[PDB]
Symmetry: C4
Subunit: 161 residues, 4 copies
Amino acid sequence: GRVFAPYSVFKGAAALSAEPRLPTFNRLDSGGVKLNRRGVIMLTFWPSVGERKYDWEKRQLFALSATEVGSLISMGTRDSSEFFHDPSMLSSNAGQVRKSLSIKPNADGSGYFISLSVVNNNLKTNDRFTVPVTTAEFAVMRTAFSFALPHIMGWDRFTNR
Amino acid sequence: GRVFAPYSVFKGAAALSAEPRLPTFNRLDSGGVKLNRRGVIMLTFWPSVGERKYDWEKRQLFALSATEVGSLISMGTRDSSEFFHDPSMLSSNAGQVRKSLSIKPNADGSGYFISLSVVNNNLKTNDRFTVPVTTAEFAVMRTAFSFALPHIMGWDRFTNR
Amino acid sequence: GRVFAPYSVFKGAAALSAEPRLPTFNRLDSGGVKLNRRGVIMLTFWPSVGERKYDWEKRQLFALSATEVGSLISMGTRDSSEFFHDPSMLSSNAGQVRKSLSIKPNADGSGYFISLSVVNNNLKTNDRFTVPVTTAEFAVMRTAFSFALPHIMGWDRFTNR
Amino acid sequence: GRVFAPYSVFKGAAALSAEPRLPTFNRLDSGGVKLNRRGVIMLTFWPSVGERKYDWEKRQLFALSATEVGSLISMGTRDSSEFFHDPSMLSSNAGQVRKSLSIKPNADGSGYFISLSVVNNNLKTNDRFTVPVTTAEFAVMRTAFSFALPHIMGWDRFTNR
């Protein structure tokens, strides 16, 4: 069933990985199949301990929706994006936990910094994992994300077979 | 058999969705299969009643042909398109019903307005559903539509398997 | 076995269609499969007789190789290409028959003219089928051809399945 | 099992070919499958002996990683790349053998030169295979490599099926 093949970037302070998560479908009794739980592109950040040694137990995740992916793949050399996620957004527990993912270009255009910030007011913690990403590394993402977008949207269920 | 996974945009005045409809094939007796009923990318518009509440019963559709899709995916930030459809085009009942879909950019380049106008002289009605679409949302469409184009054209039947 | 789903453009003087032809493989005894007869993108031109009536019996073909496809999909608004094919190229019967396909832009950038010229010195004939192609129509080709390129190259045989 | 369909360029001094090599997976007992041995795009160079006659026995290989592919597909007309590979990189036998692949544009922008240099201090040899590649030929590579990137990354294992 399960499948694992993330694209990973391992840098000085932290490690970064990315993988699609396909949407789930509830087969209706009326016939065929219907899309249920949304697909995303999952990003995982985690800290470096030893030199090129990382603590997988301190990992934090950030799910990119289809639209956030569209925003990413349409970034030029000089562009930035910032996405803001509250796992408990739109309720009383909103504000307790805030995740913000930012993607900023270097002044020289030699790549980007992809940073995940996690503020937890419940646990009283404040984490920031930053991973530099080269122009070529980021090209791999745009291309792979672009490939995966239709799949996470469930559009690959439309083939003439 | 059937498959449902539209990409949807829900805004103030109306909701917008899009999904490929694959072409149909009549298997000839001579052998193989032949393309019959054309594929399109189907757009569905429908009105907002309550706040983020929409009336699916007042929905109107607009089928984009392969060529109209090509026109869409090749739109720059500052481009516009207008497509004109008469469900009874090229007969006496032509003019009775007119659908026009327009896609116009915002002055600031923060996205587009995608509007469906429906004029029915038979029922004496005049409807206009407008849905704003962000740069990123529109990027999702171009990419998904681009992915689907070969499939709606029936070209995916050409794989080495 | 066979599969038919060309993309077609029907204009004043002639009709134009395009479809991939997949490569053939000779399964070696040593194991697996090996690519044999090359894939191409086949273009078919044929004359208009009545208004929107065409003579399929007077059709002429032009096979685009992978590299010619690469040349096509990488054409800008103002670009041209000309391809020259001798069905009996590189022998004594070379020169007997010459096919040249040209793709030229309109001055206004509203599209292209795609023209097939066929000179037969054996039969003493000289044919020229010209078909105007809009910006959007040509966008459909670039996208569909681009999709098909890996398939006609046989690269789709490399999937993780 | 095996599959062969390289894209090949045959020129004056040497021949060049390219083909994806898919990644390998070790099916875990816990369930599903996990990516193991990395995918690459394999380049093979080999010398010309007679006119359009080549010595396959003197071939040298250069494996492009996913990231090197990303660097390639994101090359403009005026760009260059150089990749440096030591088959025994990061050990005592490092430096014994060095492979460098370069891709340089022509002054006129009529294409590129793709050159593999192999220095072997063990055997005391110094080889350089150079193959000119046209704009259109290089367009075929970018497109085919781009198609294959997700497959060599193992992302095609994520389809809704």
